Design a protein around this ligand. Structure first.
Ligand code: ZN
Lengths: 288, 51, 41, 292, 315
């Protein structure tokens, strides 16, 4: 069995959150930790959660593979469940991008000579943004299968070919030493229901009107700004009569366009005002 | 939808390398133009099929 | 004759109603994904 | 002794580790799950950042048969210090659903390992609640509400779930299917208003139910609770007279401001319509004179 | 010419060329290209051989009189080395006797029963996959309960290589009948198996189960289209497609549009749009009007779905 291209690594919420927390805490040191999961089958590599290996005084090299810490953590994690294998290791590459280096290749070789199906997930906390956490597992090419030129990839499905290899990743060599894998975060109803709590305000804050002096100073300032912006709008309309389109396409690049400011001020003050009215009336009626 | 597609495609286009400002000191031929690019030296550039 | 015209017009109306509901829902989700893509970029 | 119990902040990782722990050890009903709440302290706002599992055991019997390993706490401490020396033990959490008998007793076991007063974190791991499933309970000593010996008991603290840069990225990625990223400002504020009103109604119903219980003497008489309720009644303003006139004049001024803003919005729409009509006429002329 | 600029040192290109050759001589009882470029067939590893034998089966479609003996030097018992060629042989044998097959059904049932006992043997699993795919094909609508039981036996082996084919054959065997027991069994089993392939296979089997029963399949649409596993909604789309198949009923179309616009997993979006294309197959004039709005969406999966919808509708 020459593997397949439809192989997908399933990262749980716990694993990804711990990954990001540990990666951001060690910038720019390439911290590394193991990856507790299970091999469901040939096509799926489940990952339950991860724990961090200590970063020895090496600097920006992933070479601290201390065995005492790994053995102790594995043995006395068993006391409270998590009976799983040593499926993979993750190390953060902050700033450069998702790609393996020679040291990373050697470490993954060491892991492969122990499990032969060990992924090499590479977090990147620096260039990750709220919705596009960049994550992609890797696994080394076999060896002399390049004589057959059949790197272990049987495209029995389109699910693996959809992902596109990165540009700079190919520079370090993607399809030359480690065929890429797919990443599929699998959630749970309990977890997604209740992570919503991060954006649930305190109950005793909705009916709290703020001090009734700032709500008048803000209104007066907004009205004065509106007057000035309306005057600027008048002069804008006056000046627009004798301008050619090749300038208007670039006219308001460097100066305040006195139209979007007017609309923004109107909308913001109207929203604030409506909220203030509703809060005042609601408390005046219900609180009494 | 056109706005959304443009915004989605913008991410790839930003990573494409930029372009130097050139200066046409002399026209050489019908397909080669001598251009002095600031601030290092000059080059014999190729005109696109539009210009 | 006339019955066929009535039924064809009814079918056209019903398909158009499908189209209208489709377009409204797609408007809402295009707003959502526009905000998401603006954030992602 | 440090008084640091004003505010509590929890990163989502501690809580999700709690949920993972509960779903991992296959805890059935009545089986509580307990771990440690590693974080940073010595400031006014106690902040919980990381957690781990503990081999807590207890039979549903006499409350003193609770068992917990002592070496495990220090053994986890050493490894976590090796990983990060900025996270120190600040107490413990249990997997809800509500306070139990041994909470005061077991808290003293963590007194030596902790440096400040140990922090209790209730986690509604099975999610019966509607608001935040987390609340803090710092064990402090205060006089009895019944005029009896001073008791060392728990005090509720205002707990707010807040994430840092590292965990906000993951939270935003994970629930990037249900959160309404469009939403709208005024709409979301009004929704928050309605949610707050519903929460007020729920708390009022709970207080009414408790009073109904106390009149039947299923619970004893606490004079502190009754005094707080009477203070709540005293603080209730009477509106339905001078305050009424002041509120009316402020509302009138505020509505006038709203009127002005709506007028400005309408004129902006007018300019947009004029410009759009101009561009449409230009496009029509373009197509007409270029076709011909 | 196609084989020229398509290296056989690629499972993708080898499978492409094999499938194209099978379609070029579909039912023509002529494997001249295969009998000419034998070295090209030599460049087949693992699942590539499966597709080659399947194409050989496609070529001899309708040759019920003498088709078994051509597949005889590929069936179990012969001097075949790779298990992927015996599995492909069974698949092609099921392919050849499509519809008018009763001896093939018995032969494949015997093979399934004999070899289903073994568990974990990587040689047994591929043969089981091929035999199950064949026997499901040789029992389309026959509602052979013995075949269904033999296919349930293999699917319970929990093997990810034979699980998908076992589920698909189980769905094909009970096609259209809508058995109230197979429905419950497969739906319950889909929510337990950790393997991803088996879940989608069971979803597609459930979709095949409800073929034709328009009002009777109103349930399992509220369930699966509101399920949590993103693979089960993919099956709900196809269940809508096959329940209200060629009818144009508006409940199905409205729900399909709602799924195709409001969902996170793009795979289900593609499935929903393909289902939309399948529902309106009797109104092929209208389809390029509903899908015209679909074909300009930002998401590429929806575009592939509407392409497939056009392909299915105006076939
Ligand atoms: Zn590295």
């Amino acid at each position: 069995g020459r593997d397949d291209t439809k192989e997908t690594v399933y990262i749980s919420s716990i694993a990804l959150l711990k990954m990001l927390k540990h990666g951001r805490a060690g910038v720019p040191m390439e911290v590394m930790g193991l990856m507790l999961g299970e091999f469901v089958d040939d096509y799926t590599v489940n990952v339950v959660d991860v724990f961090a290996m200590p970063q020895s005084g090496t600097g920006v090299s992933v070479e601290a593979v201390d065995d005492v810490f790994q053995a102790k953590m594995m043995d006395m994690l068993k006391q409270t469940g998590r009976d799983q294998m040593v499926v993979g290791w993750y190390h953060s590459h902050p700033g450069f991008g998702c790609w393996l280096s020679s040291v990373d290749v050697n470490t993954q070789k060491s892991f492969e000579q122990l499990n032969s199906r060990a992924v090499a997930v590479v977090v990147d906390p620096i260039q990750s943004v709220k919705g596009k956490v960049v994550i992609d597992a890797f696994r080394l090419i076999d060896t002399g299968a390049l004589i057959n030129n059949l790197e272990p990839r049987q495209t029995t499905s389109n699910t693996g070919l959809l992902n596109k290899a990165n540009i700079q990743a190919l520079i370090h060599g993607l399809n030359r030493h480690y065929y890429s894998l797919n990443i599929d975060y699998h959630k749970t109803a309990k977890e997604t229901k209740m992570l919503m709590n991060l954006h649930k305000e305190q109950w005793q804050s909705g009916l709290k009107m703020y001090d009734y002096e700032e709500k008048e100073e803000s209104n007066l300032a907004a009205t004065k700004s509106m007057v000035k912006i309306a005057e600027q709008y008048s002069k804008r309309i006056e000046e627009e009569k004798e301008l050619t389109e090749e300038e208007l396409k670039t006219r308001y690049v460097g100066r305040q366009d006195p139209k979007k400011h007017l609309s923004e001020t109107a909308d913001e003050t109207l929203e604030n005002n409506i909220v203030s009215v509703l809060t005042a009336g609601v408390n005046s009626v219900a609180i009494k | 939808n056109d706005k959304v597609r443009f915004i989605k495609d913008e991410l790839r286009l930003l990573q494409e390398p930029g372009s130097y400002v050139g200066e046409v000191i002399k026209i050489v031929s019908d397909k080669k133009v001598l251009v002095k690019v600031q601030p290092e030296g000059k080059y014999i550039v190729d005109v696109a099929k539009d210009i | 004759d006339i019955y066929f015209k009535l039924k064809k017009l009814e079918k056209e109306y019903e398909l158009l109603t499908l189209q209208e509901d489709y377009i409204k829902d797609e408007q809402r989700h295009l707003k959502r994904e526009l905000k998401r893509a603006q954030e992602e970029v | 002794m440090s008084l640091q119990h004003e505010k509590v902040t929890i990163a989502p990782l501690v809580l999700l580790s709690a949920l993972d722990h509960y779903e991992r050890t296959q805890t059935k009903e009545n089986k509580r799950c307990v771990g440690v709440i590693l974080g940073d302290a010595n400031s006014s706002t106690i902040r919980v950042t990381n957690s781990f599992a503990l081999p807590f055991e207890e039979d549903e019997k006499n409350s003193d048969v609770w068992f917990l390993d002592h070496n495990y706490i220090e053994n986890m401490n050493e490894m976590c210090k090796k990983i990060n020396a900025k996270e120190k033990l600040i107490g413990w959490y249990h997997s809800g659903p509500k306070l139990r008998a041994s909470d005061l007793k077991i808290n003293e076991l963590f007194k030596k390992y902790t440096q400040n007063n140990p922090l209790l974190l209730i986690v509604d791991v099975k999610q019966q609640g509607v608001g935040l499933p987390t609340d803090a309970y710092v064990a402090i000593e205060q006089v009895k509400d019944d005029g009896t010996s001073t008791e060392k008991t728990f005090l509720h603290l205002p707990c707010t779930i807040e994430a840092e840069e590292a965990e906000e990225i993951g939270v935003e990625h994970l629930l990037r299917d249900v959160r309404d990223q469009a939403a709208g400002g005024l709409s979301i504020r009004l929704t928050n208003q309605l949610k707050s009103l519903k929460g007020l109604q729920s708390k009022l119903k709970d207080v009414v139910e408790y009073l109904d219980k106390v009149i039947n003497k299923e619970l004893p008489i606490n004079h502190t609770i009754l005094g707080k309720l009477q203070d709540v009644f005293n603080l209730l303003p009477n509106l339905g007279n001078n305050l009424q006139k002041a509120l009316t004049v402020k509302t009138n001024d505020e509505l006038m401001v709203i009127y002005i803003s709506n007028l400005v919005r309408s004129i902006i729409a007018f300019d947009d319509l004029i410009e759009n009509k101009i561009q449409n006429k230009k496009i029509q002329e373009q197509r007409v004179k270029d076709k011909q | 010419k196609s084989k020229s600029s398509l290296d056989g040192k690629f499972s993708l290109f080898h499978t492409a060329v094999s499938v194209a050759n099978g379609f070029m001589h579909a039912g023509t009882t002529d494997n001249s290209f295969i009998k000419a470029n034998l070295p090209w067939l030599g460049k087949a590893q693992n699942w590539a051989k499966f597709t080659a034998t399947a194409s050989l089966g496609v070529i001899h479609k309708g040759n019920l009189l003498e088709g078994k003996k051509v597949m005889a030097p590929y069936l179990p018992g012969s001097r075949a080395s790779s298990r992927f060629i015996k599995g492909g042989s069974l698949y092609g044998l099921g392919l050849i006797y499509a519809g008018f097959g009763r001896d093939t059904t018995d032969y494949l049932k015997n093979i399934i029963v004999e070899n289903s006992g073994t568990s974990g043997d990587e040689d047994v699993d591929v043969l089981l996959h091929g035999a199950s795919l064949g026997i499901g094909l040789a029992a389309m609508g026959s509602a052979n309960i013995e075949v269904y039981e033999a296919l349930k036996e293999v699917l319970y082996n929990d093997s990810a290589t034979s699980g998908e084919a076992a589920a698909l054959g189980m769905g094909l065997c009970m096609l259209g009948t809508g058995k109230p027991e197979a429905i419950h069994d497969m739906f319950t089993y889909s929510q337990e198996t950790q393997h991803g392939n088996i879940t989608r296979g069971l979803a597609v089997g459930l979709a095949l189960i409800n073929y034709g029963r328009q009002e009777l399949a109103d349930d399992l649409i509220t369930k699966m289209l509101a399920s949590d596993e993103s693979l089960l909604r993919y099956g709900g789309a196809f269940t809508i497609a096959l329940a209200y198949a060629g009818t144009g009923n508006n409940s199905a179309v409205k729900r399909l549009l709602h799924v195709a616009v409001s969902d996170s997993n793009d795979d289900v979006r593609r499935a929903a749009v393909i289902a939309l294309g399948f529902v309106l197959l009797r109104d092929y004039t209208t389809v390029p009007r509903i899908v015209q709005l679909l074909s300009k969406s930002h998401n590429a999966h929806v575009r592939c779905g509407t392409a497939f919808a056009l392909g299915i509708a105006c076939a």
